Design an enzyme around this catalytic site. Structure first.
Site, PDB file in Angstrom:
ATOM      1  N   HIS A   1      28.713  29.605  46.259  1.00 30.08           N
ATOM      2  CA  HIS A   1      29.384  28.367  46.596  1.00 30.08           C
ATOM      3  C   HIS A   1      30.778  28.341  45.967  1.00 30.08           C
ATOM      4  O   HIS A   1      31.080  29.124  45.051  1.00 30.08           O
ATOM      5  CB  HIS A   1      28.550  27.158  46.179  1.00 30.08           C
TER       6      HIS A   1
ATOM      7  N   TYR B   1      33.101  17.886  33.774  1.00 27.94           N
ATOM      8  CA  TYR B   1      34.264  18.379  34.483  1.00 27.94           C
ATOM      9  C   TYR B   1      35.092  17.202  34.921  1.00 27.94           C
ATOM     10  O   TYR B   1      34.617  16.350  35.683  1.00 27.94           O
ATOM     11  CB  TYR B   1      33.853  19.202  35.707  1.00 27.94           C
TER      12      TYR B   1
ATOM     13  N   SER C   1      27.188  18.811  34.735  1.00 23.53           N
ATOM     14  CA  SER C   1      26.426  19.911  35.320  1.00 23.53           C
ATOM     15  C   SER C   1      25.762  20.772  34.263  1.00 23.53           C
ATOM     16  O   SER C   1      26.229  20.809  33.130  1.00 23.53           O
ATOM     17  CB  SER C   1      27.365  20.786  36.144  1.00 23.53           C
TER      18      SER C   1
ATOM     19  N   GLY D   1      26.673  25.116  28.563  1.00 24.42           N
ATOM     20  CA  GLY D   1      26.934  25.019  29.991  1.00 24.42           C
ATOM     21  C   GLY D   1      25.750  25.519  30.814  1.00 24.42           C
ATOM     22  O   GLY D   1      25.567  25.123  31.966  1.00 24.42           O
TER      23      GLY D   1
ATOM     24  N   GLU E   1      25.378  31.371  40.230  1.00 23.95           N
ATOM     25  CA  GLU E   1      25.262  30.965  38.829  1.00 23.95           C
ATOM     26  C   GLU E   1      24.999  32.163  37.907  1.00 23.95           C
ATOM     27  O   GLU E   1      24.560  33.226  38.361  1.00 23.95           O
ATOM     28  CB  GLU E   1      24.144  29.920  38.659  1.00 23.95           C
TER      29      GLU E   1
ATOM     30  N   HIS F   1      31.141  31.857  43.774  1.00 20.29           N
ATOM     31  CA  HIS F   1      30.254  32.450  42.771  1.00 20.29           C
ATOM     32  C   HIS F   1      28.802  32.049  43.016  1.00 20.29           C
ATOM     33  O   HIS F   1      28.541  31.047  43.701  1.00 20.29           O
ATOM     34  CB  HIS F   1      30.646  31.980  41.370  1.00 20.29           C
TER      35      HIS F   1
END
Ligand code: 08P
Ligand code: NI
Ligand code: ZN
Lengths: 345, 8
Positions: A269, A170, A281, A163, A183, A181
């Site tokens: 975000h 997703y 992603s 990930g 990253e 959060h």
């Protein structure tokens, strides 16, 4: 540049679009990063994949049912592990009358519904699936191999973090959410919506991130006591009306199938899916990220949280500060407005 | 370690 720190949208030509890292540096030269989030619309001639009709048997090994609890713009989201299911089955549920997107005219309407209904009828999110939908032959903006300096982690130490240096898929349905959060290691992330309904986003400028943090500690003081980095648990939802009420600057944007969202180091975000869709992603880095990674405040309280050794990055890209840093004497102050060093061009 | 999007 971009003194309003408003989310910017970019429409690169195929020529500009070809070099990934280079283009990220370009949008940073235009102040994109100040918003914490940016959209990039690919050349219309560009597609990552031919047809999506062959994925119906793709396995989602660990769907999660999102149970949101709270009121008045402040929620804590709990996840319930569900048995594996195929994309085919998932789509059936997403489109079922029980889970399908409601009716609506303007996004603002759908948005009011999301914030009104999110604690009701817990939806299922097809999250964190290892894999890629890119055809092997696609060399532009390939989430499988972006060739950024984040590659150094694998190249040097052989370490894979799923990930983060590998892609995730997703599968969303109406009202599935991602909480507030930044990253892991305050990296960048890239998010491509392969197909389906929109994904809407909220973003707080990195220059205001500490204000969001302080607000959050105030709303959830028990959680902040237990872990400094509690927002990294990805359980915290906060409505735009609440941000407004407390004067946190933020912007919103809606991502449509075929579009990229980029998130920038320490850009907070959150968002939600409009209905059945699929996004791919992963994380990535630039030289500018390095100082963010060195200073990232990390979750203490859970085991095996993602932690990347900065040593290789500091030795290679800040040889002059290496001994100082290793000594705990490196005092560098981050200036969030400054573009990545690659933007000199 | 792995990336995970969800709280708990
Ligand atoms: O791409 C991201 O940075 C991001 O937060 N994606 C979330 C997964 S955490 C989503 O699409 O639901
Ligand atoms: Ni994210
Ligand atoms: Zn924690």
């Amino acid at each position: 540049l971009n003194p309003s720190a408003r989310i910017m949208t970019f429409y690169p030509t195929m020529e500009e679009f070809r070099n990934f890292s280079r283009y990220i540096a370009y949008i940073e030269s235009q102040g994109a990063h100040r918003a914490g989030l940016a959209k990039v619309v690919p050349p219309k001639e560009w597609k990552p994949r031919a047809s999506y009709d062959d994925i119906d048997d793709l396995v989602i090994p660990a769907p999660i049912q999102q149970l949101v609890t709270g009121q008045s713009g402040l929620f804590t989201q709990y996840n319930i592990q569900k048995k594996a299911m195929t994309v085919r089955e998932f789509r059936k549920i997403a489109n079922s009358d029980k889970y399908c997107t409601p009716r609506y005219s303007e996004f603002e309407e759908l948005e009011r519904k999301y914030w009104k209904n999110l604690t009701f009828n817990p939806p299922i999110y097809g999250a964190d699936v290892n894999g890629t939908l890119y055809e092997k032959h696609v060399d532009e903006w390939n989430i499988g191999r972006l060739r950024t300096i984040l590659d150094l982690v694998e190249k040097e130490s052989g370490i894979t973090i799923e990930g983060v240096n590998t892609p995730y898929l997703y599968f969303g349905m109406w009202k599935t959410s991602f909480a507030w959060h930044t990253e892991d290691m305050d990296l960048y992330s890239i998010n491509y919506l392969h197909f389906g309904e929109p994904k809407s986003w909220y973003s707080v400028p990195p220059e205001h991130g500490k204000r969001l943090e302080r607000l959050a500690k105030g709303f959830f003081p028990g959680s902040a006591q237990s872990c400094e980095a509690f927002l990294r648990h990805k359980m915290t939802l906060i409505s735009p009306l609440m941000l407004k009420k407390y004067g946190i600057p933020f912007d919103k944007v809606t991502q449509e199938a075929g579009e990229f969202m980029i998130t920038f180091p320490y850009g907070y975000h959150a968002g939600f899916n409009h209905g059945f869709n699929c996004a791919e992603s992963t994380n990535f880095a630039t030289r500018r990220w390095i100082e963010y990674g060195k200073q990232a405040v990390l979750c203490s309280c859970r085991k095996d949280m993602v932690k990347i050794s900065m040593d290789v990055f500091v030795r290679k890209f800040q040889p002059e500060r290496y001994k100082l840093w290793k000594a705990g004497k490196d005092n560098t102050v981050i200036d969030h407005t400054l573009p990545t060093p690659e933007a000199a061009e | 370690a792995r990336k995970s999007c969800g709280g708990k």
